[PDB]
């Protein structure tokens, strides 16, 4: 506690959360992004909105937040308020009517190597096309396009943690079964700028309805 108090005071005495945490402005901050789907809260076919409970793990190295553990009694990791540090501004591009960005600023785990792990919770109300023709026996391919809103791919590169979303903590929905899921990183190019790519990670879930209820109560 005494060691960690000293450490936190010394880390944040001159920290700036405005500029990117690189040593050289020509370097790219590389952010690993992992989506954990905790619960599929709702599907709204009328307004075409999918409500999901997620944990959005982000990992990156902050150059200025290194320390030597032997200076601080063997403290190898600390927990700090995430409002103090620079963070990537991941935005849900296909937000329907929820929050575009993270709003629950939980604690960041910071390691002596400067590696930061942040795992904020979120509720995503994404917008996706709903195909109702076969209802109730339909299946929906609905997606979440995540990307840095104001940084382009030449200054902050985002990489998916795994080719699939994390479903280990997923609570079983009572009306929809996730047939499959997958995350793809994309790198769009524009006619202004042959050099700078624009990056996004689109997670998608193919979910199938459990029709039994509509069989009993309607059919």
């Amino acid at each position: 506690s005494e060691h960690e108090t000293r450490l936190v005071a010394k880390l944040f005495k001159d920290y700036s959360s405005v500029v990117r945490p690189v040593e050289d402005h020509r370097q790219v901050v590389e952010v690993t992004v992992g989506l954990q789907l905790i619960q599929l809260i709702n599907v709204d076919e009328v307004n075409q909105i999918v409500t999901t409970n997620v944990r959005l793990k982000q990992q990156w190295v902050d150059y200025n937040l290194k320390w030597n553990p032997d200076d601080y009694g063997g403290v190898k990791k600390i927990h700090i308020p995430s409002e103090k540090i620079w963070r990537p501004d991941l935005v849900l591009y296909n937000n329907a009517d929820g929050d575009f960005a993270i709003v629950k600023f939980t604690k960041v785990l910071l390691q002596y190597t400067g590696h930061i792990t942040w795992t904020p919770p979120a509720i995503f109300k994404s917008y996706c096309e709903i195909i109702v023709t076969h209802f109730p026996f339909d299946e929906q391919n609905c997606s979440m396009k995540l990307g840095t809103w104001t940084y382009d791919g030449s200054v902050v590169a985002i990489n998916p943690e795994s080719d699939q979303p994390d479903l280990s903590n997923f609570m079983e929905s009572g009306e929809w079964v996730i047939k499959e899921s997958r995350g793809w990183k994309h790198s769009v190019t524009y006619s202004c700028c042959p050099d700078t790519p624009y990056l996004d990670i689109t997670y998608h879930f193919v979910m199938q309805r459990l029709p039994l209820y509509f069989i009993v109560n309607v059919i």
Partner: antibody
Amino acid sequence: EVQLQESGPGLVQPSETLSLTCTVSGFSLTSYSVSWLRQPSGKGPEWMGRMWDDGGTVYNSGLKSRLSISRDTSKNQVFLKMNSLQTDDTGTYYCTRDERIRAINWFAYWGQGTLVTVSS
Amino acid sequence: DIVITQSPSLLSASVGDRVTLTCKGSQNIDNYLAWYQQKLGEAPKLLIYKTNSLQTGIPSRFSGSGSGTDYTLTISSLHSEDLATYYCYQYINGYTFGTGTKLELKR
């Protein structure tokens, strides 16, 4: 400008205590950390501990139980007391002034070093 | 902690020669390497820190370089005053020092 006069007894008996004093000139202990290095005879240097500018201390984990470091800002002195001395503790002792960048420290200035020999 | 080795252990050189000393770690030191010079009966003096930054007031002869686990210190033109022991050390995970390189006059 910066000077660190390390001093103390040359010969020490086993199992008794050793006292060393580093007197600082050219800077204030309230704004620079001081650290103690040891160079055993026939071996490379090793770091023992640091007196922080804020008045705290930290020690090498292997020497945590045997070492005490303290300071007096009124006359710019830093003191090292060590117990349970053995023949293996013979060597040259340096006090150093440390630079910082954020939470990273390195040894920037050294004292002239005092030879301490443990013998009977 | 990171183990450090220095080479050569002794180096015979003549005044005016360019000379290079090598320091190698057991793990990535991430440029947190420093070089300091020691003479007999003299207080150690820091030469280089963070692999490149000259200590204030040090002659421009000394220049450092390296990456990963391998680092070097170079003297462009060896003066007679530079015959001494050179230590590399790291300050990123613990504090560990090399065995020293004793740069000595050719004969």
